[model samples]
Target: GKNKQLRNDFKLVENILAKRLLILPQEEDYGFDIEEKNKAVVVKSVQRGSLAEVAGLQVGRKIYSINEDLVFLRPFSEVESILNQSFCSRRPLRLLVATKA
Candidate 1:
């Protein structure tokens, strides 16, 4: 069960963000949560004083891309992989997001 069909119908584009986020194992958690809503990925919460909040992510925002990959209708594990990839490389994670219209 996936939302490829819904994404096809929506024709949404990921607006690549200029900011990059870095999360280290020794540091606190990324500080944000996400979930599937209305066949889309939405930010559920942003932990106060968390890196996510400092990075400017807000609740209810929709995640559009992780790095250069489109996560519109992709699996959660795919997003996880992107985070893991960034962590492994110790590189800043690039995200593209947008607010629901």
Candidate 2:
């Protein structure tokens, strides 16, 4: 019974993870632009028909993380590096963004 419960828990976690937005660029673009201001990574623009747009990201939203790596207050270069790593690995980039409050 315990083992069955564990399996169910694992399945639940997997389902949640599978639902995360994974932005894999079909070409040279991740389909979005970002700028840093006030220690936040703010979305500047999103390309039409891009993965970012498909994922529901919009301009002026604050990006809190990329691929589970914290980007808040981090240098643009560092953020790029993290994104590059994911791109190189062919892994879809997962982003956590918050709307302006």
Candidate 3:
């Protein structure tokens, strides 16, 4: 767990994306698909048998950081672009996620 806030539940997760995007050039489906309908990136589905399915990234966790980079309240374009960059950099993409109890 990791947080830089006054009061909030935040979980730090790592999901190293395989640098093989021959499937979709326009975008790489990192196992989870999220809709751009929130201030932070929310996990819609972890997929049936995708890598993230077992990455412990549970649903409803609002993603706020990618590799320690703050992405809260930013557009999905800005948020995911960093994700893309991280994937291309060949490193483990750690995420700062929010949890609700």
Candidate 4:
């Protein structure tokens, strides 16, 4: 039951990202298809997925600011960690998403 629900929700979120960004590069200049290169807060990193293995973005990707705000770069953690915490009373954390495209 749990697994099925999780899988279903994962697919739902995947649809939301259909237009966000696809495929993140592991090494800075490694992959040949890295259209962009930067850190992105893992909005929803699937378990045992790409970001999970590489930058460890399991859920929430750290962001610097919305439009422009000199933000600090704290220790980067996995997206899963952030996602887990996202539902807490605090809710909605920030992520320093690195991008090129």
lDDT of model number 3: 0.56
**Of 2 and 3, the candidate ranking higher by TM-score:** 2
Candidate 4: C-alpha lDDT: 0.35
| Number of clashing pairs per prediction, in order | 0, 0, 0, 17
| Model 2 regions lying over 4 Å from their true place | 1-20
Ranking 1 against 3 by lDDT, winner: 1
Candidate 4 lands at a TM-score of 0.22
Q: Which stretch of 10 consecutive residues in model 4 shows the poorest summed lDDT? A: 28-37
Worst 10 residues of 3 by lDDT: 17-26
Error of 1 at 75 (Å): 2.1
Local accuracy of candidate 3 as per-residue lDDT tens digits, 1-101: 33454223222222231111111112355667665554667778777765665566667677766666667656788877776666666455566565453
Give residue 18's error in model 3 in angstroms.
Answer: 25
Residue 14 C-alpha lDDT in model 4: 40
If scored against the real structure, what TM-score would every candidate get?
0.61, 0.69, 0.60, 0.22
Tell me model 1's lDDT, rounded to 2 decimals.
0.65
Model 2: pairs clashing at backbone N, Cα or C within 3 Å: none
Give a tens-digit lDDT track for model 4, residues 12-100.
Answer: 54453322222332333111111112553333333454443344333444333322322334223433343333334333233334332
Candidate 1 clashes between residue pairs 3 or more apart in a chain or in different chains: none
Local error of candidate 1 at residue 13 (angstroms): 6.6
Candidate no. 2 TM-score: 0.69
State in Å the error of residue 77, model 2: 1.7
Best by lDDT: 2
Return whichever of 1 and 2 wins on TM-score.
2
